[PDB]
Structure 1
Amino acid sequence: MIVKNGEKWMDRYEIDSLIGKGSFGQVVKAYDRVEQEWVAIKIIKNKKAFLNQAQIEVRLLELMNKHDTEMKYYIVHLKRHFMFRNHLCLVFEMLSYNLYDLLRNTNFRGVSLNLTRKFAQQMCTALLFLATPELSIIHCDLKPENILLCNPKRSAIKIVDFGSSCQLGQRIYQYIQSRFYRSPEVLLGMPYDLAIDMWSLGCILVEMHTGEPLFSGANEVDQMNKIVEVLGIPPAHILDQAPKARKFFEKLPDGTWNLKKTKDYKPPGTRKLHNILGVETGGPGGRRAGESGHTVADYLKFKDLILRMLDYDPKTRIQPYYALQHSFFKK
């Protein structure tokens, strides 16, 4: 759909400019003459596949809207939706630029542990809200691009893009999440729950501080090999139940598992998060040496929290309420 600047819709919206495009369609900046404010309008493609998935997005955003709690305000606000020219249109508040843009602006050197902490607290609060029993919403595509600043002057953030999201027990696709942020249970083809978003968050927070993705797999096999470098071979009790385990691993006589080797990775569990973060060595690439708020003790709390987020076992992986009580967040 070609949307000209100055185009007026329904004696209400004046289209200004293109913010973004996705597989789903496009996001435009528009002036709402009724509320007298600028808004973001997500315009879905006029194809059944994109319409039907955006209808789930509208349902989940409206479900969240009717849950007024102090935990709901880290999610982008859907103001309303309408059909126009056979396109479903979702109207949101305006937000600012995304956390990938923030990282690009650091030259991929990362933000401070103090700003990482502020982002972590907001995102853990959002995940606590989505875990409300009557919502039980799995975002399914958390990544820096889907986390937006509320204001370019400030460090408040909101999650956007519920285009992949589903309630617990309403799973459609086995192949979900962006690869760098994909949980082991999804790589392994297992039934997933809200814990896959906590995995993603763990990955995101390390990247926000280092500047680089923690696990930048070129395909699923490379992804799982990059996870095993840092965390070791997944536990047997997980691999024993995993449809896709033999995509990556081999089982032996004594019920133990090992990596499937291909043509010539660091040995399992030897690429230590301790060294990626530079806990004892001045932070990532030693670039935080002597900076305030980047002490070994600060780093050890961060490292502990991340390793709880990167638990292989989705049943024992830290949950949002308990992540909010972690020492990383204590003054």
Structure 2
Amino acid sequence: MIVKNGEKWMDRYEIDSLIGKGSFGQVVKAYDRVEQEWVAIKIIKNKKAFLNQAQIEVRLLELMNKHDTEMKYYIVHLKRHFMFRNHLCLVFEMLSYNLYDLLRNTNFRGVSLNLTRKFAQQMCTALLFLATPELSIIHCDLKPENILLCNPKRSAIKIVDFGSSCQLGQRIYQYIQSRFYRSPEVLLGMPYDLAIDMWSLGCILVEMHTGEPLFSGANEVDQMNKIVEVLGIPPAHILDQAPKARKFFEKLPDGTWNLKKTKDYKPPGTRKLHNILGVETGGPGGRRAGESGHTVADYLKFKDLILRMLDYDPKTRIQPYYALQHSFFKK
């Protein structure tokens, strides 16, 4: 499309500037003369594939909007949508910069355990809202870039980008989530549920504090190998029901599984989250040695919560309500 600054749409919106680009199209800053406020307009490409998937995004945002709870306010607000020049246009409140930009601004050294906690509490409350039975929405693409500050002065956040999202039992794609944040059940080709967003969140929170992705795989095989370095071989009962188990693993006579190895990873379960976090060693790279709010006891609570979020079994992985009751969140 490539929209000029100064362009006026429908005697209502004046286009200012490009905010961002994506596979879906583009996000522009625009002035709404009716509400008298700035808005972010997500402009979908005029191609059937992108239109049809953005129509699901619009449906799921409208579904969330009509459930006024108190847990609804960690999702970006869709104000309205329209068709213009054969592009579906989604009008959102303006938010600020994203949590990947936040990490880039720390030179990838991470934010404090106290700021990590504030993000974790908001995100767990968002996931509790999506798990409302009448919604049952799987975000499917949680990552730092898809979490935006509400205000550059403040630590409030909202989730954006429901472009991959589906309701439970309305799955389209087997291959979903951004690779670094992709759950073992998705890597293993298994039917997925809301628990894949909790996996992503556990990956996200470690990264927000260390500055670096927990599992930075170059491809699905490297991904699973990096998860196994930290968490060990997945349980047999999961691998036994997994269509893609033999992408990564090999079963042996006695009903046990091991990695397929290629040409020359740390042995399974030996890259300890205890050491990645630096629980007993002054935090990541020892850079938090001495800082208040970064005691061993504070770290052990964080580590415990993360290891519950990174349960291989989506049935036993911690769920949002129970994550909100964790000791990590008690003052």
TM-score range, shorter chain: over 0.9
Percent of pairs with identical residues: 100
Residue 104 of structure 1: SS of its match in structure 2?
A: helix
Question: For each residue in 1:42-92, what CA deviation from the matched residue of structure 2 results, as whole angstroms up to 9, or x when unmatched?
Answer: 000000000000000000000000000000000000000000000000000
Distance, in Å, in 1 between the alignment partners of 2:282 and 2:19 is: 38
Question: For each residue in 1:18-62, what CA deviation from the matched residue of structure 2 results, as whole angstroms up to 9, or x when unmatched?
Answer: 000000000000000000000000000000000000000000000
How much does 1:179 deviate? 0.1
Question: For each residue in 1:169-215, what CA deviation from the matched residue of structure 2 results, as whole angstroms up to 9, or x when unmatched?
Answer: 00000000000000000000000000000000000000000000000
Residue 3 of structure 1: SS of its match in structure 2?
A: coil
Distance, in Å, in 2 between the alignment partners of 1:202 and 1:161 is: 19
Partner of 1:237: 237
How much does 1:251 deviate? 0.4
Partner of 2:133: 133
Residue 28 of structure 1: SS of its match in structure 2?
A: strand
Residue 270 of structure 1: SS of its match in structure 2?
A: coil
Residue 122 of structure 2: SS of its match in structure 1?
A: helix
Distance, in Å, in 2 between the alignment partners of 1:170 and 1:65 is: 20
Question: For each residue in 1:286-315, what CA deviation from the matched residue of structure 2 results, as whole angstroms up to 9, or x when unmatched?
Answer: 000000000000000000000000000000
How much does 1:283 deviate? 0.0
TM-score (norm 2): 1.00
Question: For each residue in 1:233-287, what CA deviation from the matched residue of structure 2 results, as whole angstroms up to 9, or x when unmatched?
Answer: 0000000000000000000000000000100100000000000000000000000
How much does 1:2 deviate? 1.5
Distance, in Å, in 1 between the alignment partners of 2:277 and 2:285 is: 8
How much does 1:320 deviate? 0.1
The equivalences for 1:1-331 within 5 A come to: 1-331=1-331
How many pairs are equivalent? 331
How much does 1:158 deviate? 0.1
TM-score (norm 1): 1.00
Distance, in Å, in 2 between the alignment partners of 1:24 and 1:225 is: 31
Question: For each residue in 1:83-142, what CA deviation from the matched residue of structure 2 results, as whole angstroms up to 9, or x when unmatched?
Answer: 000000000000000000000000000000000000000000000000000000000000
Residue 289 of structure 1: SS of its match in structure 2?
A: coil
Distance, in Å, in 2 between the alignment partners of 1:53 and 1:326 is: 36
Distance, in Å, in 2 between the alignment partners of 1:103 and 1:30 is: 27
Unpaired runs of 5+ in structure 2? none
Distance, in Å, in 2 between the alignment partners of 1:44 and 1:257 is: 45
Distance, in Å, in 1 between the alignment partners of 2:116 and 2:197 is: 17
Q: Which runs of 4+ in 1 moved over 4 A?
A: none
Distance, in Å, in 1 between the alignment partners of 2:284 and 2:143 is: 20
Distance, in Å, in 2 between the alignment partners of 1:296 and 1:149 is: 29
Distance, in Å, in 1 between the alignment partners of 2:4 and 2:256 is: 61
RMSD: 0.2
Residue 207 of structure 2: SS of its match in structure 1?
A: helix
Distance, in Å, in 2 between the alignment partners of 1:258 and 1:149 is: 42
How much does 1:152 deviate? 0.1
How much does 1:329 deviate? 0.0
Residue 321 of structure 1: SS of its match in structure 2?
A: helix
